[PDB]
From a paper:
The first comprised the full-length PR-RT protein and an RNA/DNA hybrid with 15 bp and overhangs in the RNA strand (a 2-nucleotide [nt] overhang at the 5′ terminus and a 1-nt overhang at the 3′ end [substrate 1]). The sequence of this substrate corresponded to the PPT sequence with the preferred RNase H cut site that was located 13 nt from the recessed 3′ end of the primer. In the structure of full-length PR-RT, the electron density was observed for all four domains: PR, POL, connection, and RNase H. The POL-connection part forms a globular core of the enzyme that is very similar to the p66 subunit of HIV-1 RT and XMRV RT. However, in the present MFV PR-RT structure, the RH domain is well defined because of its stabilization by crystal contacts. In the structure, we observed the electron density for 17 nt of the RNA strand and 15 nt of the DNA strand of the hybrid substrate. It is bound by the POL-connection fragment of MFV PR-RT in a manner that is similar to those of other RTs (HIV-1, XMRV, and Ty3), with the 3′ recessed end of the nucleic acid duplex located at the active site of the POL domain. For the full-length protein, contacts are formed between the POL domain and nt +2 to −6 of the RNA/DNA hybrid. We note, however, that the 3′ end of the DNA in our structure is slightly displaced from the active site, most likely because of the unusual placement of the base of RNA nt +2 in the grove of the hybrid. The fragment of the substrate that comprises nt −8 to −11 interacts with the RH domain of the symmetry-related molecule. Contacts of the RH domain with this part of the substrate result from crystal packing, and such positioning of this domain cannot be accommodated in a single molecule of MFV PR-RT.
Author numbering: 4 to 51, 53 to 208, 211 to 605, 608 to 622, 625 to 721, 728 to 749
The structure:
Amino acid sequence: PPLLQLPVEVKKTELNGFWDTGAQITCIPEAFLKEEIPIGEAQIKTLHTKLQSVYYLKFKVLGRKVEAEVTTSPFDYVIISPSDIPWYKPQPLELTVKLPVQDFKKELINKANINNEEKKQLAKLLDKYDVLWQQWENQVGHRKIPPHNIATGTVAPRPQRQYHINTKAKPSIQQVIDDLLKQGVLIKQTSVMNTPIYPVPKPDWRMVLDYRAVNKTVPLIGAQNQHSLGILTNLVRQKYKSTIDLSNGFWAHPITKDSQWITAFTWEGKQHVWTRLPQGFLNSPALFTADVVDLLKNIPGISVYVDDIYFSTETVSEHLKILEKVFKILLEAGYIVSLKKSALLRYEVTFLGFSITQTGRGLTSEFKDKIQNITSPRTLKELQSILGLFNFARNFVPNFSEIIKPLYSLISTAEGNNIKWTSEHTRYLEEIVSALNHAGNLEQRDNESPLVVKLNASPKTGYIRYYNKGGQKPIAYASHVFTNTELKFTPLEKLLVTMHKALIKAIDLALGQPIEVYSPIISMQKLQKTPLPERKALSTRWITWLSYLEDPRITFYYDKTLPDLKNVPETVTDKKPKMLPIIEYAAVFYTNGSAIRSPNKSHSSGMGIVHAVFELTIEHQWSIPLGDHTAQYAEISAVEFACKKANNISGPVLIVTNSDYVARSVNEELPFWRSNGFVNNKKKPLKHISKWKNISDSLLLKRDIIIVHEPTSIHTQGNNLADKLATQGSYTV
RNA sequence: UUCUUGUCCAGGAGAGG
DNA sequence: CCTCTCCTGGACAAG
């Protein structure tokens, strides 16, 4: 049914003709009828339908003489009406492997979310446009446009040598190469330029065209390319929605004969060039996208990314009429639709890697399933893949840059191909995964309301929120942690750094609407002449913010409702520090004490600490008197002594007492004691407060110190040793 | 980095306090 | 010992 392309010769020149069932009269390029007398003028139905001069011409079609009425055309190919050659019978195209298009049709009607009476109407619609759907693997369409001149550079790239590639990919690529040859997309032709080719393994391979040398010479097309975050916010969220997929839209757009030389590549000795734009060329995405947005530009409320088309309506009848209208445009143009990659009439549909629901835009269930079954990384490539996968939800949850900063910092400390992974990093990953599992759907931007941003900043991170004026649910989130440069900023300066990032994404989300900024800033006019001593940044950062005030469309306010995060300190950590194996600690400290009754005196106490590095080795040992002091005082001074010695050694260190009280109190209350001025439950000064202060500050200077006490074990041997030393100290008095 | 969108890395070259 | 600028060469995700 998708017919075939047949050759045609006009004025003793070979050309390519397409048998068009919809064309009433045949058309020929303009450069061929310039020296001929027109019969007259007739209305010709195009997509732009103004009359052109009609002619009468004779030419050879497949070696057969024909005579017919013709009109001018800007194309480089010939269009042939079926009426003019009634002798010709259409021959269906033959490729390598056929698609279960009938099965694709049934999958789309079954997973369609309508009543049975509406399914019958849509089923007849799908059967009617059977020519539109891709019925063969690697099938390509024929877009009715003037070919693209892509060799628009003023200099040529150097030919590139081609290396050998894997043998198993070679026959998998040969199946698609032959398919593109039989459709006329690839022709075996030599050229001055040649580009390398390498294969990427498919999950079942694939072919990539390294076009770096070519792209370094071709200028950017004037058509800008859409941003994924912008089209997802600016789309309409109706109940009945559908997404259509154009299969190989790149290979449906022809290119001019004078530009095909640049698309050459050597495969198995022979050299091939492209009749249509290839994937990997610089401007090929922009021309495809710009073309498809132009056809459905008249159709309202419809987003479109590369090879996917999305729209939505509230009436199922309205949705059915749009599909017919869209299918007509795609068939008249020359595109083909992949049914296995498209979804129609679904309350919930996955568009651009995200699920569009009634509730709002949301993550894919398959994406959430992929998150949970993620192992801990082992190499740099593994970690990079994990980070890139996780990034999809940066706009979905605030504090994303906060919670992911350590992993991004771990990639910088990583050398070679191995990254230093710890048991604290895996707990971070499970926390990341759980936070992503507890995600929430966002709202969609509307063109009527002016965009409003709400931003607030802690001394460590700035937080951004995107809403609509009077809206409840936010459109997106944004977070940015301050760098080492930005952390030394004044809090006023940190708020402006946060506003900077908010305004770039706001411009992408503005949609030609005024922007309102809610922030803890009290005024902006006074910020223009801020005195220099209050500035901790340089002139450059201050100039960009001053430049933002000159924009009248945006306006700023002071939202006192915002939480005060500028002066709040970090809360007490409740996570228990995981312990490394005893061979991984730089040194291990065992501390002990003693109390002995003494002759009008209470005690004769002593201290006992040992320096041990790991087998186990006694590096240093200490035994000293303390005099008239309680047993608990000797223990606290013992673990204090080890904290100072631990401060001297680099790397994680482990300290153990034989007193559960000191170890338990240190882990459970030393942070609270640090803040409340070292007072007890009765709001009274602790005993040994000066000793607690020294332990406190030694714990802050070296935060990888782990205090714990467990006391027959491995630590029992040295606990007994340190206990022996405490007695000897006590006696020397 | 085939290319698009997005988040990052490194190298080099310099200039400023 | 910082900070900022602009050029080049790269990494990952899924389209």
